[PDB]
Design a protein around this ligand. Structure first.
Ligand code: CL
Ligand code: CL
Ligand code: MG
Ligand code: MG
Ligand code: MG
Ligand code: MG
Ligand code: MG
Ligand code: MG
Ligand code: MG
Ligand code: MG
Ligand code: MG
Ligand code: NA
Ligand code: NA
Ligand code: NA
Ligand code: NA
Ligand code: NA
Ligand code: NA
Lengths: 186, 95, 140, 156, 154
RNA sequence: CCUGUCAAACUCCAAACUUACAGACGCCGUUUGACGCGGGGAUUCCGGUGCGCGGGGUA
RNA sequence: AGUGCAAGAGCAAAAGAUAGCUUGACAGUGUUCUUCCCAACGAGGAACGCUGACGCGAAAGCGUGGUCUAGCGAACCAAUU
RNA sequence: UUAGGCGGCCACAGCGGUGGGGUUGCCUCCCGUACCCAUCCCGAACACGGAAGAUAAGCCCACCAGCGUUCCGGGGAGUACUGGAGUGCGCGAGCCUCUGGGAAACCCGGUUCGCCGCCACC
């Protein structure tokens, strides 16, 4: 920018999207990466492999195409994340993928975080991933119990119209239950 | 030379042009080579580890197995056969 | 366009740059939340050679905690103009600084895909005076 | 000491003051002479062109310049002309003043490296070339043979 | 296709230059070889440029020299039309010559020594201290220029 | 802004050239066995000169 | 800028700073390069492994002292495990 | 790719600036702290929960060359330098010819305001 000697960071560092030092350590395993990403409204889970001209995504799952299986609730929460993980995990298995390492990008390794939920789901789908059980949420929160109880302190629906008034961690079970057998795209 | 350490007279070859300065891309540090492939040896000034003796910068050897993640490349110094322990970060496929 | 262009108060830092404290107490009551130590850098003649060393405290207030404070701070100040930032900030007073900016500031304070706010979307000294002056007082 | 000792450019360039100390000051008084307040807004422009690469000790530079400018007082102390010596003595020079043991010499002076065909002096004058004469005396005190060249001046 | 003639001796000539002449089958002064115009051969003659005389000869001249100084891979045998016909793909010297010139074959391919051991130039050459452009005899020549040399050393 | 100069221990630049490997041609080797491996016997470790590039030195 | 100390080189979501935790400055045994270009030669040094035991981390992973090139010593004898 | 995620090359992509775009696939800003989690003080950030509002930031799209960068034409320049050769020149420093290569600065005019891969998606 300033001169011939100036040093311009790599594009993905400029965009503040890729942590290259973490990326290298990640690529060390020689295993596929379980890319866990979030958005204000959604949660994505991809299984990426290394390629000659860039990464190759062999299997993915988005919290949006979750409804495609009977999801009638918001998609930016814990239950959402886990399921998206399991969905991508399953599609992963179908693709012949057996193991991966968790890439959480620029997100924080906070216990009970959605990225770990994503990790828990992918694992249950059958994917073999280096993890640590007590950094994961306690199942109930994964189910969405923390939100149901939050609506108990109602007075006004936590969900604007949406579905239910007292929410359903049960809707969660029905869905996980569904994903664990047959159905298309899995 | 006034001294005989490995970095004697390496000011040039072990320095980056101002623009290539800073941590290098990970793609080439993870590159995989097969036994028999021809690889060019060239130290990446930005990459500390996996280096080999500066005297071999410029050599083109043959991958013959590895040690840990590091590769074992056979070269011929003058008329002498030598084996060099080096990481992908400092290797490039010939042709 | 507007609504997302109109100024707002983001943190008010009240700090007492002492030179070695007991002062925290008053900051705690004047604001309403714990003060933070103020270590210093460099060794200097004012018998301040200690690098890591408590030499004052500060308190960053946000939201109501900031208004409810300025609703008494401002009144105790007269000044205006020249004493304003080029980014629409101003410090008066024991110091009390007011950082002002518009709605999409998080874009530069978050971790992922962060970005510096465009000069156009920045807050000017003038656009600042307006906002505040338009809230219980007068400029210059 | 004779110019014979330092007039050739056979040694490596030796100019890094960060590695050389005790370098004698230069004898060259000024580089800009005459009406330095004015810019080269003159009809005629003559130059003194060295005809062989050589090293010129600040000694000779000062004597050559003085002899030229001191003479350009055929026009007066505040005459209308501007005189410029464009080269500076950057090359530090030594002398081995023990015999050939530990002979790296000690700094004794400075000299300017001028390549054949460069102009060492440039004067600016109105059709009043007394300067041509100021230079016959100038290249009289520098090692090389020289060429007195006139540039803007088809007023022959 | 160019005719190469060593005009300067081995004493004091770079070794890598001497080897080159040897790779081109010339091991003595006045020995001559025919070389195809290829990138690889071009580089070689360029390196040998200062101790040789080269150029594209005329059909005739090649014919005169072939007849006068060509030899079997082994033996004294004169290479005349009959020899050419009874030993090569061609029917006579001219046939061979043409093939050589159009770089369709080589002296070896036809059972002939790659070297035409010429005679000292009758009347002497232009000197081995200067190139042609300077009145000497070194370097690239004209077809008419090469022919005179070759013919003088016939 | 304009204007005057430099670098063996400066470099936004940058040769010729030297150099690793590979293919091609050449030359060479397969009864003249090359490339290489193992073993026996040395001599040698005062050098000099020309040319090119040098460093020191008035030389 | 800083990174203990020459000089040159490396380093920015770090190799720097702060905080916290920890003792991998661990035992064993090698591969290779270096010392000694080519091209034989010891001590020393480094890179890269493996076996075992550990530290930290969600994990990939990092730690075979300090970012890299100086800070080193044979046989005999003694003391020590 | 009517806005996305992971990347390769790592400025041709930087710096600066203009215009355009969203009841929705969307991304954001945004709204909000019972929870997991969090600030040596602050739900600012990090983390979690969520849509009342907005397209003003960001982002995506179209474009501008003033600066920086890349490549090209013409000029500088076959100049500077240089591998090989010479009973060519010069008191000498050094130069010249033949042969094989061949620059930098700068000026003027173009180019460049990223390209490409995988996945997902009215
Ligand atoms: Cl994310
Ligand atoms: Cl090595
Ligand atoms: Mg050098
Ligand atoms: Mg014979
Ligand atoms: Mg006679
Ligand atoms: Mg003669
Ligand atoms: Mg060399
Ligand atoms: Mg280290
Ligand atoms: Mg003893
Ligand atoms: Mg003892
Ligand atoms: Mg807009
Ligand atoms: Na780099
Ligand atoms: Na003495
Ligand atoms: Na003279
Ligand atoms: Na050793
Ligand atoms: Na403290
Ligand atoms: Na916008």
């Amino acid at each position: 920018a300033t001169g011939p000697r100036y040093k311009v960071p790599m594009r993905r560092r400029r965009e503040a999207r890729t942590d290259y030092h973490q990326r290298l350590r990640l690529l060390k395993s020689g295993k596929p990466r379980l890319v866990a990403r979030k958005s204000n409204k959604h949660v994505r889970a991809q299984l990426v492999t290394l390629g000659p001209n860039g990464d190759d995504t062999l299997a993915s799952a988005h919290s949006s195409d979750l409804a495609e299986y009977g999801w009638e609730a918001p998609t930016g929460n814990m239950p959402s994340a886990y399921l998206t993980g399991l969905l991508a995990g399953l599609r992963a298995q179908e693709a012949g993928v057996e193991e991966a390492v968790l890439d959480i990008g620029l997100n924080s390794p906070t216990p009970g975080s959605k990225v770990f939920a994503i990790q828990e789901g992918a694992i249950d789908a059958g994917l073999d991933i280096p993890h640590n059980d007590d950094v994961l949420a306690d199942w109930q929160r994964t189910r969405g119990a923390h939100i149901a109880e939050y609506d108990e302190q109602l007075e006004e629906p936590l969900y604007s119209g949406d579905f239910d008034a007292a929410d359903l961690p049960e809707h969660f079970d029905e869905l996980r239950e569904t994903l664990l057998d047959g159905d298309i795209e899995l | 030379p006034s001294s005989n350490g490995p970095l004697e007279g390496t000011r040039g070859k072990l320095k980056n042009k101002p623009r290539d300065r800073g941590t290098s891309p990970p793609q080439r540090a993870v590159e995989e080579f097969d036994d028999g492939e021809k690889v060019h040896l060239k130290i990446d000034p930005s990459v500390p580890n996996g280096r080999f003796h500066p005297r071999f910068d410029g050599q083109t050897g043959t991958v013959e197995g590895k040690q840990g993640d590091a590769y074992k490349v056979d070269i011929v110094d003058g008329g002498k056969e030598k084996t060099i322990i080096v990481t992908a970060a400092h290797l490039r496929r010939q042709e | 366009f507007h609504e997302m262009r109109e100024p707002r108060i983001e943190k008010v830092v009240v700090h007492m740059g002492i030179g070695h404290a007991n002062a925290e107490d008053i900051l705690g009551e004047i604001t309403g939340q714990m003060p933070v130590r103020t270590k210093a850098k460099r060794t200097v003649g004012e018998f301040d050679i200690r690098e890591g060393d408590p030499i004052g405290a500060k308190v960053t207030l946000r939201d109501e905690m900031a208004e409810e404070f300025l609703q008494t701070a401002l009144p105790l100040a007269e000044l205006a103009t020249s004493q304003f930032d080029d980014t629409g900030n101003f410090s008066f007073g024991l110091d009390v600084t007011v950082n002002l900016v518009r709605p999409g500031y998080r874009v530069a304070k978050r971790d992922k895909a962060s970005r510096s706010i465009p000069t156009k979307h920045r807050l000017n000294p003038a656009d600042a005076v307006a906002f505040i002056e338009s809230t219980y007082d007068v400029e210059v | 000491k004779p110019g014979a000792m330092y007039r050739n450019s056979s040694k490596p360039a030796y100019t890094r003051r960060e590695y050389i100390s005790g370098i004698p000051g230069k004898k060259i008084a000024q580089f800009d002479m005459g009406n330095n307040g004015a810019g080269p807004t003159y009809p005629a422009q003559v130059e003194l062109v060295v005809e062989k690469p050589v090293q010129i000790r600040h000694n000779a530079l000062e004597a050559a310049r003085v002899a030229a400018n001191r003479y350009v007082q055929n026009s007066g102390a505040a005459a209308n002309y501007k005189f410029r010596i464009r080269k500076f003595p950057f090359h530090v020079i030594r002398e081995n003043k023990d015999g050939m043991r530990a002979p790296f010499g000690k700094p004794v002076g400075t000299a300017a490296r001028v390549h054949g065909a460069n102009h060492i002096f440039i004067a600016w004058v109105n059709p009043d070339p007394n300067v041509e004469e100021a230079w016959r005396r100038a290249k009289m005190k520098v090692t090389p043979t020289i060429n007195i060249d006139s540039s803007p001046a088809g007023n022959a | 296709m160019h005719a190469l003639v060593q005009l300067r001796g081995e004493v004091n000539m770079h070794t890598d230059i001497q080897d080159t002449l040897e790779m081109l089958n010339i091991h003595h002064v006045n020995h001559c070889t025919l070389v195809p115009e290829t990138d690889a051969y071009r580089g070689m003659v360029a390196k040998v440029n200062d101790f040789v005389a080269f150029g594209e000869p005329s059909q005739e001249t090649l014919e005169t020299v072939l007849a006068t100084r060509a030899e079997p891979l082994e033996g004294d045998a004169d290479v005349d039309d009959e020899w050419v016909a009874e030993h090569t793909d061609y029917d006579d010297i001219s046939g061979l010559a043409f093939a050589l010139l159009s770089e369709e074959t080589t002296l070896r391919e036809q059972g002939l020594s790659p070297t035409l051991r010429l005679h000292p130039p009758r009347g002497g050459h232009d000197g081995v201290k200067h190139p042609v452009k300077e009145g000497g005899q070194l370097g690239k020549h004209d077809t008419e220029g090469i022919d005179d040399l070759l013919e003088a050393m016939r």
